[PDB]
Amino acid sequence: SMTEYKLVVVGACGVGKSALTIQLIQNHFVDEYDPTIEDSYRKQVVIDGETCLLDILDTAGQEEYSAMRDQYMRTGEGFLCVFAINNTKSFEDIHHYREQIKRVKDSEDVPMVLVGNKCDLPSRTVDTKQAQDLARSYGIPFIETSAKTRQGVDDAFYTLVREIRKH
Ligand SMILES: */C=C/C(=O)N1CCN(c2c(C#N)c(=O)n(-c3c(C)ccnc3C(C)C)c3nc(-c4c(N)c(F)c(F)c(F)c4F)c(Cl)cc23)CC1
Ligand SMILES: Nc1nc2c(ncn2[C@@H]2O[C@H](COP(=O)(O)OP(=O)(O)O)[C@@H](O)[C@H]2O)c(=O)[nH]1
Ligand SMILES: [Cl-]
Ligand SMILES: [Mg+2]
């Protein structure tokens, strides 16, 4: 049988959670996808010779989902923690996303990948060095992405599957 992986995409409003997810699922860039929509998407992929069924939850942090947030997160096997390379606040928020994931999962060994999105844009305010130092402090990988060009997007999700395997 195919190995099934429940992945959860988190991070500040506007970092590109939806754009990243829709690239993997539908192979196109969506400009300004409805920021309020939270849904799960399924995709079959081959990673290192293993057929994987991915169930990806694209979080939107809306008030209507707030009561059930912990129940939705607890079934996640791995988390993509996304910031944008032109938004320092989204990078500062990463340690808070990790605080909440560690709380819900009651563990410091939750499979996780740090993702720096929008690497196509010129006006960078967070360097790869900063993100790699943060990832190293957590013992997790860092992957740079552009949801616009699709560069690195699959590497981010596939890296998270490899982290879930180690767990
Ligand atoms: C464009 C809309 C959008 O993408 N988002 C809306 C807001 N959102 C979000 C926010 C905000 N603003 C937020 O403050 N937090 C919380 C909460 C509610 C409580 C404590 N810390 C945070 C941040 C700073 C980590 C969000 N948390 C989560 C969330 C929660 N509650 C959780 F328990 C987890 F285990 C998570 F993995 C997790 F990520 C989410 Cl879904 C969304 C926000 C961002 C998205
Ligand atoms: N140039 C560029 N724009 C992006 C990228 N990813 C997302 N966007 C845009 O950034 C905004 C926020 O993206 P969205 O996917 O809605 O973020 P979410 O709130 O995290 O789901 C939208 O206007 C997207 O079109 C990227 O890699 N490059
Ligand atoms: Cl929430
Ligand atoms: Mg979204």
Side-chain angles (χ1 to χ4, degrees), residues 28-160:
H28 65 110
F29 175 60
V30 178
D31 192 9
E32 303 207 8
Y33 186 68
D34 187 333
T36 70
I37 298 188
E38 174 157 338
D39 206 357
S40 62
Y41 294 88
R42 274 149 301 287
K43 182 63 81 183
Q44 186 181 169
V45 299
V46 180
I47 305 171
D48 309 331
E50 186 184 45
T51 306
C52 304
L53 188 55
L54 307 188
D55 187 3
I56 305 171
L57 175 60
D58 176 26
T59 66
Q62 300 300 114
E63 291 190 5
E64 74 198 284
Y65 281 65
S66 56
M68 285 291 284
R69 173 57 58 205
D70 289 357
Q71 291 198 29
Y72 297 148
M73 301 294 84
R74 201 190 314 281
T75 62
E77 293 179 280
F79 294 77
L80 277 195
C81 294
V82 185
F83 70 95
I85 62 87
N86 65 340
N87 193 274
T88 56
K89 188 171 192 314
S90 73
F91 181 67
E92 291 188 22
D93 277 353
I94 291 292
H95 69 109
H96 299 310
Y97 284 93
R98 178 168 171 280
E99 283 159 357
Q100 295 303 312
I101 291 162
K102 283 195 301 94
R103 176 185 60 82
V104 170
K105 299 293 294 176
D106 184 47
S107 176
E108 285 206 282
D109 280 294
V110 182
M112 188 175 285
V113 174
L114 183 61
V115 176
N117 189 45
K118 312 199 186 177
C119 69
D120 56 288
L121 291 177
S123 304
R124 172 176 293 266
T125 58
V126 183
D127 294 345
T128 290
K129 170 63 154 58
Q130 295 172 255
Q132 286 179 159
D133 289 349
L134 182 59
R136 185 193 292 102
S137 79
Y138 299 154
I140 70 176
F142 170 66
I143 301 290
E144 172 174 76
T145 64
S146 172
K148 179 160 192 161
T149 69
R150 205 188 170 148
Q151 288 172 35
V153 172
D154 304 85
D155 290 332
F157 285 100
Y158 289 15
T159 297
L160 182 54

